[PDB]
Design a protein around this ligand. Structure first.
Ligand SMILES: COc1c(Cl)cccc1Nc1c(-c2ccncc2OC[C@H]2CCCO2)[nH]c2c1C(=O)NCC2
Length: 308
């Protein structure tokens, strides 16, 4: 007698969109910037539109609808809410547009203009998202800076439920460098496996978007982590913060911190952020309508403020 999933799935009309351009084309698929105008509502919601790069395969539609099923359930301010789907030739997914791209891109673009209060706030907001997924018996299995988006520089959410599953998966092509040891060796996945991923995600941000193990082919990694080696201490990181990362990369998964705790410990550090991250001119830096300004600005509503 498992709980019944009562989530409403919404079906949207191609007539109600306007694919302004392509935001990004990658291995994940193709994401288009769009504007969704629901008919009679007199509101204009900016959206992103996900669609695998292959034309209408029966296999492609299977996997999109599994990503749709997962995101249809989740409601959290640090997890992408699926607004609905459009049933065209290929199935298209539709969420709120996250205008400042993925976080990995953002930190690389703003290496010289990001303070500690942003970095620490991000670590919190991610840990908050991941904790919400833990509360919904749901393991993400692909957490990384690339799969975190930026609604504003002050607000991030978690994306890509491609590999996500509920409650041991038999495996295919996976990102080794963000995976726990037991996930590489025995292909066992769990909430604490995502903590390892979360640890590497933090290292990603604190190194202003370095590639983990830059130039080390992925077959080797299992051999390195078995030999007790882990990622280095970033230069801006105190032992305090680096100690938290190292605790995510423990052999024993019980010994890893829980998202619950990570939320608290980072929340604490965000109150006095210069005690934990030492950055050159940390005090000076501040980030962003003075940019945004698109065509017809009247009757525009952020998705966050619409269905609810
Ligand atoms: C939540 O699932 C989506 C759904 Cl249902 C619909 C559209 C997009 C996504 N999600 C993603 C975005 C994205 C989201 C919202 N706005 C914009 C965006 O794309 C921005 C570009 C910058 C480079 C990289 O994407 N981006 C990536 C994804 C993704 O799923 N995987 C990795 C990349």
């Amino acid at each position: 007698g498992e709980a019944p999933n009562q989530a409403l799935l919404r079906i949207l009309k191609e007539t109600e969109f306007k694919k302004i351009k392509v935001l990004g084309s990658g291995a994940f698929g193709t994401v288009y910037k769009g504007l969704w105008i629901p008919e009679g509502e007199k509101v204009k919601i900016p959206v992103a539109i996900k669609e695998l790069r292959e034309a209408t395969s029966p296999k492609a539609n299977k996997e999109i609808l599994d990503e749709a099923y997962v995101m249809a359930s989740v409601d959290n301010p640090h997890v992408c809410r699926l607004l609905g789907i459009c049933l065209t030739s290929t199935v298209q997914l539709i969420t709120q547009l996250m205008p400042f791209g993925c976080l990995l891109d953002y930190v690389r673009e703003h290496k010289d203009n990001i303070g500690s209060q942003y970095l620490l706030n991000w670590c919190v907001q991610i840990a908050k998202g991941m904790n919400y997924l833990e509360d919904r018996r749901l393991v993400h299995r692909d957490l990384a800076a690339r799969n975190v988006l930026v609604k504003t520089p002050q607000h991030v959410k978690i994306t890509d439920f491609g590999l996500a599953k509920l409650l041991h998966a038999e495996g295919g092509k996976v990102p080794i460098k963000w995976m726990a040891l037991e996930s590489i060796l025995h292909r066992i996945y769990t909430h604490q496996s995502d903590v390892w991923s979360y640890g590497v995600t933090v290292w990603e941000l604190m190194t202003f978007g370095s590639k983990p193990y830059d130039g080390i082919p992925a077959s080797e990694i299992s051999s390195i982590l078995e030999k007790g080696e882990r990622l280095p201490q970033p230069p801006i990181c105190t032992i305090d913060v680096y100690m938290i990362m190292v605790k995510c990369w423990m052999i024993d998964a019980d010994s890893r911190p829980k998202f619950r705790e990570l939320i608290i410990e980072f929340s604490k550090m965000a109150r006095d952020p210069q005690r934990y991250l030492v950055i050159q001119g940390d005090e000076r830096m501040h980030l962003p309508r003075a940019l945004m300004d698109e065509e017809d600005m009247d009757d525009v509503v952020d998705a966050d403020e619409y269905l609810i």
